[PDB]
């Protein structure tokens, strides 16, 4: 898990915020997921007086469950350019994850998740989206994979 | 010797060279000989670089396309839809995609 883990606090509503200037060389991507503040302990201190919670710790245990509560994400570079630009996505300005209005299309499988996010996940996990959608092989489908846990 | 004698990626084997070609030939031969029971090969890292040219366009083209039918006729037994899909000017697609929604 070659990554820099950055946990940002979320008040129990709405949306959030992002980082300063940097080099962004040899970057490999983002991995986003929500945790419960009660379940995540402090890291720097040797002891956490405010933990008061046994059971699974998702942050250092790998048991994530709130990742389905994401609606959409937008990535901007230099506060001027959107990342998924070049009209790459169905919604080219930002990554939609769940769309609830469903007035027009853009919903994949038979669930709430939208097609562009489905294609992004297929490419990220198995490199499938471009040559048609099919079940990835067993060795490539593992516990932390996507279709192993996707339940419409 | 990290930033001065070598570039950092080559020094840390992020993009420089494969293990079989930056290790000593004697060490490579030893690892091959003792791979069955001692398996030296784990300890050394390969770069696994991705191509950086002539692979993707970066010319503002879309991945998914929504085509609406030019006309539709529906008897109470069949629902016929007629589409005309334009395959860009240079891009190609395989019909393993293009599912009917």
């Amino acid at each position: 898990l070659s990554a820099a883990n950055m946990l940002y606090p979320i008040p129990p509503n709405a949306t959030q915020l992002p980082i300063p200037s940097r080099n962004w060389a040899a970057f490999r991507g983002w991995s986003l997921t929500r945790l419960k503040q009660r379940e995540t302990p402090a890291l720097g201190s040797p002891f956490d007086p405010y933990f008061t919670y046994s059971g699974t710790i998702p942050y250092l245990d790998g048991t994530f469950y709130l990742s389905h509560t994401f609606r959409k994400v937008a990535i901007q570079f230099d506060s001027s350019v959107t990342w998924p630009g070049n009209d790459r996505l169905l919604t080219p300005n930002e990554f939609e994850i769940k769309i609830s209005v469903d007035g027009e299309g853009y919903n994949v499988a038979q669930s709430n998740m939208t097609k562009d996010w489905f294609l992004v996940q297929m490419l990220a996990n198995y490199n499938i989206g471009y040559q048609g959608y099919h079940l990835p092989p067993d060795y490539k489908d593992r516990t932390f994979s996507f279709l192993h846990n996707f339940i419409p | 010797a990290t930033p001065s004698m070598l570039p950092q990626w080559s020094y840390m084997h992020i993009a420089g060279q494969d293990a079989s070609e930056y290790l000593s030939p004697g060490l490579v031969q030893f690892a091959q000989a003792t791979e069955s029971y001692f398996n030296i090969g784990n300890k050394f890292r390969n770069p696994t670089v991705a191509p950086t040219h002539d692979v993707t366009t970066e010319r503002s083209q879309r991945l998914q396309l929504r085509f609406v039918p030019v006309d539709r006729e529906d008897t109470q037994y069949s629902y016929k839809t007629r589409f005309q899909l334009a395959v860009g000017d240079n891009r190609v697609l395989d019909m393993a995609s293009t599912y009917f929604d």
Binding site: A3 | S20, F44
Partner: peptide, 8 residues
């Protein structure tokens, strides 16, 4: 020989 496995 070498290894090149990680997340991603």
């Amino acid at each position: 020989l070498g290894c090149n496995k990680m997340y991603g």
